[PDB]
Structure 1
Amino acid sequence: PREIITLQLGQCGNQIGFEFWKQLCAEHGISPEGIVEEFATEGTDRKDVFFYQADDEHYIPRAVLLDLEPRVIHSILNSPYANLYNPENIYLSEHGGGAGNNWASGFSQGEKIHEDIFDIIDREADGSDSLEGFVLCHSIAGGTGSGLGSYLLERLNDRYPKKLVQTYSVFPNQDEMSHVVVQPYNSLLTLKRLTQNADCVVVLDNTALNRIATDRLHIQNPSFSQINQLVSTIMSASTTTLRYPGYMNNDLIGLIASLIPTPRLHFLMTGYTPLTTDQSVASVRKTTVLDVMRRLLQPKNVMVSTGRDRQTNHCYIAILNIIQGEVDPTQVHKSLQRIRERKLANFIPWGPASIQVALSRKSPYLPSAHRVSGLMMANHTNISSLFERTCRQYDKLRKREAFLEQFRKEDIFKDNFDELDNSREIVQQLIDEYHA
Structure 2
Amino acid sequence: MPREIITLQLGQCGNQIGFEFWKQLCAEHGISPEGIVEEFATEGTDRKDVFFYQADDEHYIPRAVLLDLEPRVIHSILNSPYAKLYNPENIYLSEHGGGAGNNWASGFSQGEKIHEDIFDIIDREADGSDSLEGFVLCHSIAGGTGSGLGSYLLERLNDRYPKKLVQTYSVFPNQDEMSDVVVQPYNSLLTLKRLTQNADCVVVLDNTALNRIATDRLHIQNPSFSQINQLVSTIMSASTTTLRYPGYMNNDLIGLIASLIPTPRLHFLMTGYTPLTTRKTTVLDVMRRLLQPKNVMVSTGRDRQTNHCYIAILNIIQGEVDPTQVHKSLQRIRERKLANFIPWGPASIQVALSRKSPYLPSAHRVSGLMMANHTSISSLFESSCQQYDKLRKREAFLEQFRKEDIFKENFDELDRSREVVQELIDEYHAATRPDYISW
| Same-fold status (TM-score > 0.5) | yes
The C-alpha deviation readout for 1:3-36, integer Å capped at 9, x for no partner, is 1111111110011110111112223222122535
Contact 2:173 2:208 (C-alpha < 8 Å) held by counterparts: yes
Q: Which range is displaced more, 30-39 or 318-327? A: 30-39
Contact 1:321 1:357 (C-alpha < 8 Å) held by counterparts: yes
Write the distance in 2 (CA, Å) between the matches of 1:137 and 1:157: 17
Write the distance in 2 (CA, Å) between the matches of 1:45 and 1:395: 48
The C-alpha deviation readout for 1:319-338, integer Å capped at 9, x for no partner, is 11110122223321111111
Q: CA deviation at 1:259?
A: 1.7
Q: Which range is displaced more, 386-395 or 285-294? A: 285-294
Summarize the Cα distance change of 1:429–1:142 in structure 2 as closer, same or farther, 3 Å threshold: closer
Q: Which range is displaced more, 416-425 or 16-25? A: 416-425
Map of 1:372 onto structure 2: 366
Contact 2:100 2:107 (C-alpha < 8 Å) held by counterparts: no
Write the distance in 2 (CA, Å) between the matches of 1:48 and 1:235: 19
Write the distance in 1 (CA, Å) between the matches of 2:421 and 2:190: 14
Q: Which range is displaced more, 313-322 or 221-230? A: 221-230
The C-alpha deviation readout for 1:314-364, integer Å capped at 9, x for no partner, is 110101111012222332111111101222222223332331110112312
Summarize the Cα distance change of 1:266–1:53 in structure 2 as closer, same or farther, 3 Å threshold: same
For the residue of structure 2 that corresponds to 1:193, the secondary structure is helix
Q: Which range is displaced more, 56-65 or 358-367? A: 358-367
Write the distance in 2 (CA, Å) between the matches of 1:12 and 1:433: 31
The C-alpha deviation readout for 1:194-250, integer Å capped at 9, x for no partner, is 112222222221112212222221112122112101210132111112222245342
Structure richer in strand, relative to its length? 2
Map of 2:227 onto structure 1: 226
The C-alpha deviation readout for 1:43-78, integer Å capped at 9, x for no partner, is 343112111213112211000011011111111222
Q: Which range is displaced more, 35-44 or 22-31? A: 35-44
Q: CA deviation at 1:110?
A: 1.4
Write the distance in 1 (CA, Å) between the matches of 2:43 and 2:231: 27
Q: CA deviation at 1:152?
A: 0.8
Contact 1:274 1:367 (C-alpha < 8 Å) held by counterparts: no
Summarize the Cα distance change of 1:160–1:34 in structure 2 as closer, same or farther, 3 Å threshold: closer
The C-alpha deviation readout for 1:172-211, integer Å capped at 9, x for no partner, is 1123224332211211010110112222222221112212
The C-alpha deviation readout for 1:378-431, integer Å capped at 9, x for no partner, is 110222111111111112113333133442231325675444345444544555
Summarize the Cα distance change of 1:71–1:270 in structure 2 as closer, same or farther, 3 Å threshold: same
Write the distance in 1 (CA, Å) between the matches of 2:420 and 2:115: 32
For the residue of structure 1 that corresponds to 2:191, the secondary structure is helix
For the residue of structure 2 that corresponds to 1:378, the secondary structure is strand
Summarize the Cα distance change of 1:112–1:179 in structure 2 as closer, same or farther, 3 Å threshold: closer
Percent pairwise identity: 98
Q: Which range is displaced more, 39-48 or 14-23? A: 39-48
Summarize the Cα distance change of 1:23–1:92 in structure 2 as closer, same or farther, 3 Å threshold: same
Q: CA deviation at 1:297?
A: 2.3
Summarize the Cα distance change of 1:94–1:44 in structure 2 as closer, same or farther, 3 Å threshold: farther
Write the distance in 2 (CA, Å) between the matches of 1:392 and 1:367: 45
Write the distance in 1 (CA, Å) between the matches of 2:133 and 2:386: 37
Summarize the Cα distance change of 1:425–1:31 in structure 2 as closer, same or farther, 3 Å threshold: same
Q: Which range is displaced more, 85-94 or 425-434? A: 425-434
Contact 1:387 1:424 (C-alpha < 8 Å) held by counterparts: no
Q: Which range is displaced more, 13-22 or 199-208? A: 199-208
Write the distance in 2 (CA, Å) between the matches of 1:313 and 1:67: 42
For the residue of structure 1 that corresponds to 2:364, the secondary structure is coil
Contact 1:238 1:375 (C-alpha < 8 Å) held by counterparts: yes
Write the distance in 1 (CA, Å) between the matches of 2:114 and 2:98: 10
Map of 1:282 onto structure 2: none
Contact 1:208 1:304 (C-alpha < 8 Å) held by counterparts: yes
Contact 1:44 1:362 (C-alpha < 8 Å) held by counterparts: no
Write the distance in 2 (CA, Å) between the matches of 1:303 and 1:398: 29
How much is the aligned-residue C-alpha RMSD, in angstroms?
A: 2.4
Contact 1:170 1:204 (C-alpha < 8 Å) held by counterparts: yes
Summarize the Cα distance change of 1:44–1:75 in structure 2 as closer, same or farther, 3 Å threshold: farther
Q: CA deviation at 1:170?
A: 1.3
The within-5 A match list for 1:73-112 is 73-92=74-93, 96=97, 98-112=99-113
The C-alpha deviation readout for 1:266-313, integer Å capped at 9, x for no partner, is 111111111225xxxxxxx84211211111222222222215754861
Contact 1:140 1:171 (C-alpha < 8 Å) held by counterparts: yes
Q: CA deviation at 1:144?
A: 1.7
Map of 1:205 onto structure 2: 206
Contact 1:25 1:31 (C-alpha < 8 Å) held by counterparts: yes
Write the distance in 2 (CA, Å) between the matches of 1:232 and 1:307: 25
Summarize the Cα distance change of 1:322–1:104 in structure 2 as closer, same or farther, 3 Å threshold: same
Write the distance in 1 (CA, Å) between the matches of 2:125 and 2:17: 20
Summarize the Cα distance change of 1:312–1:404 in structure 2 as closer, same or farther, 3 Å threshold: closer
Summarize the Cα distance change of 1:82–1:94 in structure 2 as closer, same or farther, 3 Å threshold: farther
Contact 1:298 1:344 (C-alpha < 8 Å) held by counterparts: no
Residue in structure 1 matching 2:426, options 420, 432, 435: 432
Structure richer in helix, relative to its length? 2
For the residue of structure 2 that corresponds to 1:242, the secondary structure is helix
Q: CA deviation at 1:96?
A: 4.5
The C-alpha deviation readout for 1:80-104, integer Å capped at 9, x for no partner, is 1111112233333766564532222
For the residue of structure 1 that corresponds to 2:237, the secondary structure is helix
For the residue of structure 2 that corresponds to 1:124, the secondary structure is helix
Structure 2 alignment gaps of length 5 or more: 430-439
Contact 2:30 2:359 (C-alpha < 8 Å) held by counterparts: no
Summarize the Cα distance change of 1:102–1:422 in structure 2 as closer, same or farther, 3 Å threshold: closer
Summarize the Cα distance change of 1:423–1:143 in structure 2 as closer, same or farther, 3 Å threshold: closer
Contact 2:108 2:145 (C-alpha < 8 Å) held by counterparts: no
For the residue of structure 2 that corresponds to 1:358, the secondary structure is strand
The C-alpha deviation readout for 1:111-136, integer Å capped at 9, x for no partner, is 22111111112222343211111111
Write the distance in 1 (CA, Å) between the matches of 2:160 and 2:363: 42
Write the distance in 2 (CA, Å) between the matches of 1:270 and 1:358: 15
Map of 1:258 onto structure 2: 259
Write the distance in 2 (CA, Å) between the matches of 1:413 and 1:121: 28
Map of 2:327 onto structure 1: 333
Summarize the Cα distance change of 1:392–1:47 in structure 2 as closer, same or farther, 3 Å threshold: same
Contact 1:28 1:44 (C-alpha < 8 Å) held by counterparts: no
